[PDB]
């Protein structure tokens, strides 16, 4: 399809957590989503919230419609569960690496289904609980999913980092090593 | 031992607006797990069964002229509405890239923090645009509305030479250059 | 701050 720009409403419902998601991407970048628990519209960039508004009912009720379609499709498909698609993990920094200069490490998990993921950062082999952030379960054209995980760190030649990813398509957690 | 996949079923949908030459095209997708079974294409004007799973769904929907009339209005009701409303902060968002030249015998020109994705990175050897069998990576989405790209260059140095990386972007009046 | 439009997904025949 010919397009100068593509705007897409993407949403899903499933049995496990996250049970639902309703988002809107502009040229494959998530512009906003509806928090299904807080019942609030969350904008990706604060500049979007000052120029646009979105009634959260547009997401909550749309999730409700899909849940009905879920139960209907479960019965007609004779309870066919989809094959687990293992994820692909790549780790790269946001800015060029300079020792002592604050940076951001990006873990990109890609091409996985179902959208049920446990992702965690490891610094020198131990857990990191601060300086972390994550994106939603983003959609793909082949109806698989990808996701971003972020870690703000200070580069040092004596530090090595790992992105530990758990998924049903993996018989053992996947460690993606990265170092300067 | 363990590793038995929990019972999980998924339903997902899409609402895609394709804008081109003042025209809007609307696609609504109904997907069970990763199988698209029913689709509405505004250029077609009615629903179509993508799989045998979606034949009863597409047959009933095409029976209701009420529903069909509501989907045919979407290109003007939603696509055109959201396209004209967001024009300022999404269609015309400009972020200037930052360039960095450093070696690892390859030479890597690293471009960070740029939007949109269309960018040209050319290699020069003493003012001559010797492409020299260059290898560049695909566009890298950071997930926060910024892009990355890395362009490699096979180099064998002569002392006194200067390699220049020129970067042309829509957010730049004149090309940005950085030499090694 | 103007409001964006959305569309209701349809229920499957059932």
């Amino acid at each position, epitope marked *: 399809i010919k397009a100068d720009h593509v705007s897409t409403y993407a949403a899903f419902v499933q049995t496990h957590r996250p049970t639902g998601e309703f988002m809107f991407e502009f040229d494959e970048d998530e512009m906003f989503y509806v928090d299904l628990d807080k019942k609030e519209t969350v904008w990706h960039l604060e500049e979007f919230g000052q120029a646009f*508004s979105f*009634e959260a*009912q*547009g997401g*909550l*009720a749309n999730i*409700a*419609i899909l*849940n*009905n379609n879920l139960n209907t499709l479960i019965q007609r498909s004779n309870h066919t569960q989809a094959t687990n698609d293992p994820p692909e993990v790549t780790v790269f920094p946001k800015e060029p690496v300079e020792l002592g200069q604050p940076n951001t490490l990006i873990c990109h998990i890609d091409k996985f289904f179902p959208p049920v993921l446990n992702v965690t950062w490891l610094c020198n082999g131990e857990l990191v609980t601060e300086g972390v952030a994550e994106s939603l379960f983003l959609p793909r054209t082949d109806y698989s999913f990808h996701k971003f995980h972020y870690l703000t760190f200070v580069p040092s030649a004596e530090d090595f980092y790992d992105c530990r990813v758990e998924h049903w398509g993996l018989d053992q957690p996947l460690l993606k090593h990265w170092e300067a | 031992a363990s590793r038995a996949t929990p019972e999980n079923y998924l339903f997902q949908g899409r609402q895609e607006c394709y804008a081109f030459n003042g025209t809007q095209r609307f696609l609504e997708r109904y997907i069970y797990n990763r199988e698209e079974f029913a689709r509405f294409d505004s250029d077609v004007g009615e629903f179509r069964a993508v799989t045998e799973l979606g034949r009863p769904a597409a047959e009933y929907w095409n029976s*209701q002229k*009420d*529903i069909l*009339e*509501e989907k045919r*209005a979407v290109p*003007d*009701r939603m696509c055109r*509405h959201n396209y004209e409303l967001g024009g300022p902060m999404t269609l015309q968002r400009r972020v200037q890239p930052r360039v960095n030249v450093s070696p690892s015998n390859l030479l890597v020109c690293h471009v960070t923090d740029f939007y949109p994705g269309s960018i040209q990175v050319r290699w020069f050897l003493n003012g001559q645009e010797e492409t020299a069998g260059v290898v560049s990576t695909n566009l890298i989405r950071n997930g926060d509305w910024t892009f990355q790209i890395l362009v490699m260059l096979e180099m064998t140095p002569q002392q006194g030479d200067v390699y220049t990386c020129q970067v042309e972007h829509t957010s730049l009046d004149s090309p940005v250059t950085v030499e090694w | 701050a*103007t*409001g*964006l*439009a959305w*569309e*209701w997904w*349809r*229920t499957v025949y059932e």
Partner: T-cell receptor
Framework: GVTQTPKFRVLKTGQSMTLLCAQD?????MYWYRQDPGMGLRLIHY???????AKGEVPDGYNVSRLKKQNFLLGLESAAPSQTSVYFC??????????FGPGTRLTVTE | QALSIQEGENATMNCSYK?????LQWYRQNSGRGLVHLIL?????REKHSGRLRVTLDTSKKSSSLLITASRAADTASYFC?????????????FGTGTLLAVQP
């Protein structure tokens, strides 16, 4: 094809009841209005599918339930004299024609 | 609002809305029973016909006119306007205050 049960009702202040709306047209959307002479037709609640409802113009004092696609239930927990009105149900497939029911007039007396 | 005309003549009734809309509708209520949809005009249109009815829309003034030609006894009713809101639920309508019409014999 929209049906309302009951059609008429008289209640004592503080009593409870449930208005039942039914449609056999497989419509996805259903509404509950109240009409008083001075203000016209005003929306109480509406529903775009099973399991979901949303507030309208005058929501306070009324509850709604959509456990089935065919039925849209409107409930009054503690009836008040201000709730004496005629309550209309409607169903639709979108932002086009709304198909209304016959109406239900309810009188709350002390 | 009230109005009375003689049978066989033309009736014109007016209304106004407040928000930006995608479609406007006119409704009729006889016998104090269920309201009935009459006609729907979209924001892209200026005039539309249905039976003996002709609806006129003016987006600049945010008003509309309904014209009943060769009026009959059954046209005696109250007439409402119904609009949606751009940026809101496409199926959520807001009904305006009605005007009573009496077709005298």
């Amino acid at each position: 094809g929209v049906t309302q049960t009951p059609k008429f009702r008289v209640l004592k202040t503080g009593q409870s009841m449930t208005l039942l709306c039914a449609q056999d047209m497989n419509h996805e959307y259903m509404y509950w209005y109240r009409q008083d002479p001075g203000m016209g037709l005003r929306l109480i609640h509406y529903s775009v599918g099973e399991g979901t409802t949303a507030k309208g113009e005058v929501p306070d004092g009324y509850n709604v339930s959509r456990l089935k696609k065919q039925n849209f239930l409107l409930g009054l927990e503690s009836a008040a004299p201000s709730q004496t009105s005629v309550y209309f149900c409607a169903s639709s497939q979108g932002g086009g024609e709304q198909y209304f029911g016959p109406g239900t007039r309810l009188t709350v007396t002390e | 609002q009230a109005l009375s005309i003689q049978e066989g003549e033309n009736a014109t009734m007016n209304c106004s809305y407040k928000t930006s809309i995608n479609n406007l509708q006119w409704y009729r209520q006889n016998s104090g029973r269920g309201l009935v949809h009459l006609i729907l005009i979209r924001s892209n249109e200026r005039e539309k016909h249905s039976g003996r009815l002709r609806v006129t829309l003016d987006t600049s003034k945010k008003s509309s006119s309904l014209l009943i030609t060769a009026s009959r006894a059954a046209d005696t009713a109250s007439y409402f306007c119904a609009t949606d809101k751009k940026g809101g639920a496409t199926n959520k309508l807001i009904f305006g205050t009605g005007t009573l019409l009496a077709v005298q014999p």
